[PDB]
Amino acid sequence: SRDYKRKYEFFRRKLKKQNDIPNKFEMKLRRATVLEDSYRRIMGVKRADFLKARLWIEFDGEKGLDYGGVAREWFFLISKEMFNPYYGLFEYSATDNYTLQINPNSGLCNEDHLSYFKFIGRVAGMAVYHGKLLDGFFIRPFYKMMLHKPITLHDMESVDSEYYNSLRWILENDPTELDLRFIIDEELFGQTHQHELKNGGSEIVVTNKNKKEYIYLVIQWRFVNRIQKQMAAFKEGFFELIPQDLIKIFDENELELLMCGLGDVDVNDWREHTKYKNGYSANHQVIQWFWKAVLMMDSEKRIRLLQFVTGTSRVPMNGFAELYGSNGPQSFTVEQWGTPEKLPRAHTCFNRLDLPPYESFEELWDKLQMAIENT
Numbered sequence: 001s002r003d004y005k006r007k008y009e010f011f012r013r014k015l016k017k018q019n020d021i022p023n024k025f026e027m028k029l030r031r032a033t034v035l036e037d038s039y040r041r042i043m044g045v046k047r048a049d050f051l052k053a054r055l056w057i058e059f060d061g062e063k064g065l066d067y068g069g070v071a072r073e074w075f076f077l078i079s080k081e082m083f084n085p086y087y088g089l090f091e092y093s094a095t096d097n098y099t100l101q102i103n104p105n106s107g108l109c110n111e112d113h114l115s116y117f118k119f120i121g122r123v124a125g126m127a128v129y130h131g132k133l134l135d136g137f138f139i140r141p142f143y144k145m146m147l148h149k150p151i152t153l154h155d156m157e158s159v160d161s162e163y164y165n166s167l168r169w170i171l172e173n174d175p176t177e178l179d180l181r182f183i184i185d186e187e188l189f190g191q192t193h194q195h196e197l198k199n200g201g202s203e204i205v206v207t208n209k210n211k212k213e214y215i216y217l218v219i220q221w222r223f224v225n226r227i228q229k230q231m232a233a234f235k236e237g238f239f240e241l242i243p244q245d246l247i248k249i250f251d252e253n254e255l256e257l258l259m260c261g262l263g264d265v266d267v268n269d270w271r272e273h274t275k276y277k278n279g280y281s282a283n284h285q286v287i288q289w290f291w292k293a294v295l296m297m298d299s300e301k302r303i304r305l306l307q308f309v310t311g312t313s314r315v316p317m318n319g320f321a322e323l324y325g326s327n328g329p330q331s332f333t334v335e336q337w338g339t340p341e342k343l344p345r346a347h348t349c350f351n352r353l354d355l356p357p358y359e360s361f362e363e364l365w366d367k368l369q370m371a372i373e374n375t
């Protein structure tokens, strides 16, 4: 079979070029109004195919700049706008999570929310088509709905561990004596909201014979049922840029890496293929502070750290042992450099992180995170 790298090349080779399109797609935007200006332009074009042309974006009438770099800035700027929870379209999947899901109440304040989601889909399809990344990460059920993959109980674990444990208990044991009913209770605004799960659900006891249906219905209620129109509108915009049978060569994890440049960063594999300079070592106390700092960093900041030291967002295939610099192969390297009062600097070409010798873990935490907040 094909690994992710071979799948991506296979994918790009089928994404054949349009020639019935204007060769440039021009859009002029003002930074203060980048979302409305982008929405009116992208939702206004004749054919979605116009968005496949080379992007020529101009911000605030700033003339004579690289049309490739400003495109990358636009994708970042429009991502922070589209995925802002204050707009009511997307929301955080949980108070303790940073992953996003579609807000079920998206329509309450946005009567026109369905065209907004189609716009977000077009932008997402544009990022994939033009080889650019979106800034934002969604729950795994989001990527699976894009691929028409069924939402399973395992997907609940990555979002809510305590309810996943409860549903896994139900699956593994006879739940009849608990007298569970085909209803769902949700805690919103200090009040219980009961929702039967099928007609007459309050009178239907969850037994061994119907629990698979029960779990399925709970899964749909949590991730699918209240967002089907928003997701359909998003997919409609996305498939206007990427044919939906082409996207299906990827699984959910590959798709997230392709769209948003994100995934799990095995901190171990990072550790074993790390080299040290000028007195540092694996057992050195600053180094073991560095590694537990990275351990307790969220999955996004682990990525932003690698970008800071490498200069790229992706992890190389087969792990960190095949990591490359600018003049050939080079593993990840931490060097003693400087004095405790300075912030770490990274050298792009040699994948080297010049780390000052910090006198405390909490100091290493802050002085390291402040050097990455500007990436």
Ligand SMILES: *[C@H](CNCCCCN1c2ccccc2CCc2ccc(Cl)cc21)CC(=O)OCC
Residues within 6 Å of the ligand: 035, 036, 039, 082, 085, 086, 087, 088, 089, 109, 110, 116, 117, 119, 120
């Ligand atoms: C409900 C408030 N609804 C916000 C309006 C929609 C958001 N916009 C937008 C936002 C700022 C400036 C301009 C626009 C233009 C319209 C548009 C098009 C496309 C997209 Cl993706 C967004 C917008 C929020 C609420 O009540 O709950 C807050 C959590």
